[PDB]
């Protein structure tokens, strides 16, 4: 977006406040360059991410990421960032990319500061054609964020589906990592995915299964764009419902056999879901890196298995 010069720190009143997170006037030399800032969340305590807006060149950014964290990598106005960005646990709040609709509910917030919440949002900006920075321009790309003190009614959180045990032998034509885990909370509506493997990856499907019924939260290639698609039917996970995914890979593509890591020559299989929650109620992060109902996905729906 163009290059402001006027406060990053906007208070809009009392309770509100806008955040303008824009890289710091950068020019990236190779292609696909990662840069990373921070800004540090001038309140001490609750605040609630209640609304993005994307400031992104189409020409230049590829994708950007808003991350959560208390320790930020490094401490410059920019740095690259091909690692964790946050050297903590990093919360994602926000993924934009160029070729994919961005869809927040009304009432809904994340819960940022106090004594728990996170005190820093790290931006990640993915540049892609040098060829756009042929003239030497600087790109001040990134986020504005309405920051609000007033409790939110709903509260967004991540609910975190990984398989940890990922070895496949370099000829098997079809592998299946399925993860499952039993809903032991209150209710959580499903709203946004994000599906993530690496180069072996062909599939990957959420579901909630209630009393045998098979309701998708997201099916995706995980080898396209790697940001949040809208959930077409929004969803909602009750106590005793299982959350039940299916990553389906191959052992045709790559020439030994393959196990876990960040770097892109490893194999994970992730499936992010963004819901909320009732504010009494509300949990920011949940994981699932078990099976607890193998027997179960022998009725999983045909869609699963068919790479699109
Ligand atoms: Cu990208
Ligand atoms: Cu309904
Ligand atoms: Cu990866």
């Known amino acids: ?12 009143d009392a309770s509100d406040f806008a955040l303008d997170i824009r890289m710091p006037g950068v020019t990236p030399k190779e292609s696909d360059t990662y840069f990373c800032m921070s800004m540090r969340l001038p ?6 991410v209640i609304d993005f807006k994307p400031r992104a060149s189409m020409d230049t950014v590829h994708h950007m990421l808003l991350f959560g964290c208390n320790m ?3 401490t410059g106005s920019y740095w690259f ?13 926000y993924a ?11 009432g809904v917030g994340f819960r940022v500061g106090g004594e728990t919440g996170s005190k820093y949002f790290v931006l990640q900006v993915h540049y892609g054609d040098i060829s756009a920075f042929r003239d030497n321009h600087k790109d001040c790309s990134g986020v504005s964020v309405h920051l ?24 098997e034509k079809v592998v299946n990592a399925d993860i499952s885990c039993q809903y032991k ?35 995706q290639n995980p080898q396209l764009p790697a940001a949040f698609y809208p959930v077409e039917h929004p969803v909602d996970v009750t106590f005793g419902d299982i959350l039940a995914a299916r990553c389906v890979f191959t052992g045709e593509g790559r020439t030994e056999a393959t196990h876990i890591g960040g770097t892109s020559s490893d194999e994970m299989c992730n499936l992010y ?11 920011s992060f949940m994981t699932c890196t078990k099976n607890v109902a193998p027997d179960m996905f022998r009725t999983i729906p045909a869609e699963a298995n068919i790479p699109i």
């Not at 960032?81 to 709040?93: M, P, R």
């Not at 995915?193 to 998708?216: F, P």
């Open 1 to 12: 977006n163009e290059c402001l010069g006027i406060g990053p720190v906007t208070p809009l």
């Open 43 to 48: 309140v001490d305590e609750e605040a609630f």
């Open 72 to 74: 930020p990598s490094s």
């Open 81 to 93: 960032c091909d690692e964790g960005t946050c050297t903590d646990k990093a919360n994602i709040l």
């Open 96 to 106: 934009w990319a160029r070729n994919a609709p961005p869809t927040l509910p009304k």
């Open 148 to 171: 609000t003190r007033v409790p939110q009614p709903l509260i967004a959180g991540m609910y975190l589906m990984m398989s940890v045990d990922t070895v496949i032998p370099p000829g």
């Open 185 to 219: 909370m209150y209710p959580m509506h499903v709203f946004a995915y994000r599906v993530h493997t690496h180069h072996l990856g062909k599939v990957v499907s959420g579901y909630r299964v209630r009393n045998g019924q098979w309701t998708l939260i997201g099916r």
């Open 273 to 283: 879901i963004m819901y909320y929650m009732e504010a009494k109620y509300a949990l």
